[PDB]
Structure 1
Amino acid sequence: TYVDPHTVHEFAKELDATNISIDKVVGAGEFGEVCSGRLKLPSKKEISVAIKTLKVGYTEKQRRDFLGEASIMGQFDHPNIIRLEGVVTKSKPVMIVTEYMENGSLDSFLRKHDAQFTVIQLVGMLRGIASGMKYLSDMGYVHRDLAARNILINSNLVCKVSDFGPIRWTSPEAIAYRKFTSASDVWSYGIVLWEVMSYGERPYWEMSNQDVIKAVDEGYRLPPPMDCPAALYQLMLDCWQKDRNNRPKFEQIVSILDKLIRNPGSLKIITSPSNLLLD
């Protein structure tokens, strides 16, 4: 079971900064920079890591929000959830150190490779994401921000859930009255499924937010990505059931994808645009 943080040392190892080397800047965060580097483990093994720093002159609220992410992440030890190696708090800059994911955020990765992966490769990515979400939901953690931009992908194309800190990704009931449940994460997973099969196209493109909300409420849904297998478009539609009780559970999604992996011929049945489809 996940436990809410409103203490980081309950679920995070304090790392010795002597064991951390910084290579290069790879991103910018809400709280500071993100860089790649190396961590020397107690066993002397050296691994690649990502390193997030807390900007100099941070507020106490920024420090709490920053470390709160580590307090959450550190609760989850799963191959498809980003691994917290530890934190540095006894020296400054304060740091959160995670496993390195060479191919970065999934949405930007797929946009660089439009139509270049096999369907079975894409299904492999999606099964990873579903398996990580199955574990989070098993722990009673509702992610609320599941999106392709919040999944990281490593050198072997293994995808892992990130962003333990968005109308297009949010279920109608969560939009309507903040009803967030693992079923609203399943809705979001449906959107990620579409993002993946669309090679990182933006869900609902740049439609006015009020129109995203109204259209989905009226029963309109994102259309099948080009060359999308029928099995995968149906899974999207299933994830986007209006009635949250009718959506599949993450364990069911994992099982569906495992069958598709086992019987790749299943994927050969293909469905039938920047237009929504009624239903």
Structure 2
Amino acid sequence: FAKEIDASCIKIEKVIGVGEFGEVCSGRLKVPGKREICVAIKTLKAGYTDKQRRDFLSEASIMGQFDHPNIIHLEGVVTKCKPVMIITEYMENGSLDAFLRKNDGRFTVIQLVGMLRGIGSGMKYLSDMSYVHRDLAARNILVNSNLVCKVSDFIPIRWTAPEAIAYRKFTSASDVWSYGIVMWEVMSYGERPYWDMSNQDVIKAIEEGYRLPPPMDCPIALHQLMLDCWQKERSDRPKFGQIVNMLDKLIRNPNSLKRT
């Protein structure tokens, strides 16, 4: 379950984002005898019904099940008071996509692989627990000042495995397809998968065996892993545990990254 936070322990600073669901703010959380931390705060949109509130505190419930360094950390919720809130750890560099696009070219290959290794590690934990994300993309990964990447966001054609589009068959294996797309996003500093191709173009390309090329200057071993993730038969794709082990190995033997 999710912890109740006394609203007096919370100080809101600024609105950092908006959406149909409401607003996300940044602020500070100070519990007595504990160090103050920065936090992000998600609030339910004005005039919400009881149904909507329940659907909101349901997302906190789910998040509350996860305790892993690469999954966004739930501080708690406010429910004694109005409006309801969900409080998470503050992630200084925000969303991964936006982040890479503002820093195009600035990191090393090894740093990028580190980010991908963290994301892979969070997805292994998620799928270990029989949870399917369904919406895995760089926009739904958050990034802290130490470049630690954490899975967030508890449909998008370009990111979705063929069997999930065709049969609405969503599993950890279609999450692995999506992870492959994330690797490509990362190594490209946030380029749009499939560029100006339309959704229909993408669907038919995939079906005919088209797969995205290496991003510019991307190691061959990394692109080969993307290709593994995009195997047509879902059973042919690597498991997240194998993805993480492969990335540890590339990291452990940095010469394997030389070939581009």
Q: TM-score range by the shorter chain?
A: over 0.9
1:153 matched to which residue of 2? 143
Task: Please say if 1:195 is aligned against 2:185.
Answer: yes
Instruction: Give the aligned partner of residue 91 of structure 2.
Output: 101
Q: Deviations over 1:176-218 (max 9, x none)?
A: 0111110000000000000000100011123211111111111
CA distance in 2, matches of 1:13, 1:42: 15
Give 1:33 deviation, angstroms. 1.1
Q: Hey, what does 2:62 align to over in structure 1? A: 72
Is 1:23 the counterpart of 2:10? The answer is: no
Quote how far apart the aligned CAs of 1:42 are: 5.0
Q: State percent identity of aligned pairs.
A: 85
Provide the rounded CA distance (Å) in 2 between the counterparts of 1:248 and 1:41: 43
Match of 2:240 among 250, 260, 269: 250
- 1:40-51 aligned within 5 A: 40-51=30-41
Q: Which runs of 4+ in 1 moved over 6 A?
A: none
Give 1:56 shift.
1.8
Deviates more, 1:152-161 or 1:46-55: 46-55
42 and 74 in structure 1: CA distance in 2 versus 1, 3 angstrom threshold? farther
CA-CA distance at 1:69 after TM superposition: 1.4
Query: Among residues 71, 78, 85, which one is paired with 2:75 in the alignment?
Result: 85
1:172 paired to 2:162: yes
Amino acid corresponding to residue 97 of structure 1 in structure 2: I
Deviations 1:21-55 (A, max 9, x none): 11111111332111111111354221110001112
TM value normalised by structure 2: 0.97
List per-residue Cα deviations over 1:163-187 (Å, max 9, x = no partner): 01x1111100000011111000000
1:147 is aligned with what amino acid?
A
- Does the residue aligned with 2:132 lie in a helix, a strand or coil? coil
1:124 aligned residue: 114
Runs of 5+ consecutive residues of structure 1 not aligned to the other structure: 1-10, 271-279
Amino acid at match of 2:50: E
Q: Work out whether residues 136 and 178 of structure 2, in 8 Å CA contact, stay in contact via their aligned partners in 1.
A: yes
* Equivalent residues, number: 259
Retained in 1: the 8 A contact 2:10–2:29? Answer: yes
Could you tell me the TM-score, scaled by structure 1's length?
0.91
Distance change in 2, residues 1:167/1:94 (3 Å): same
Question: What's the secondary structure of 2:21's corresponding residue?
Answer: coil
Residue 29 of structure 2 corresponds to which residue in structure 1? 39
1:70 Cα shift? Answer: 0.8
- Please state how far the C-alpha of 1:159 moved relative to its aligned partner: 0.1
- Consecutive unaligned residues in structure 2, runs of 5 or more: none
Match of 1:183 in 2: 173
Q: Which residue in 2 is equivalent to 1:234? A: 224
Of residues 135-144 and 43-52 in structure 1, the stretch that sits farther from structure 2 once superposed is 43-52
* Alignment correspondent of 1:133: 123
Question: Any conservation in 1 of the 2:20–2:45 contact (CA below 8 Å)?
Answer: no
1: CA distance, partners of 2:196 / 2:85: 35
Contact 2:96 2:141 in 1 (8 A): yes
Corresponding residue for 1:3? Answer: none
Aligned residue type for 1:64: R
Contact 1:85–1:98 at 8 Å: present in 2 too?
yes
SS across alignment from 1:220: coil
- 3-state SS of the aligned residue for 1:233? helix
Instruction: Name the structure 2 match of 1:110.
Output: 100
Instruction: Report the residue type matching 2:235 in the other structure.
Output: N
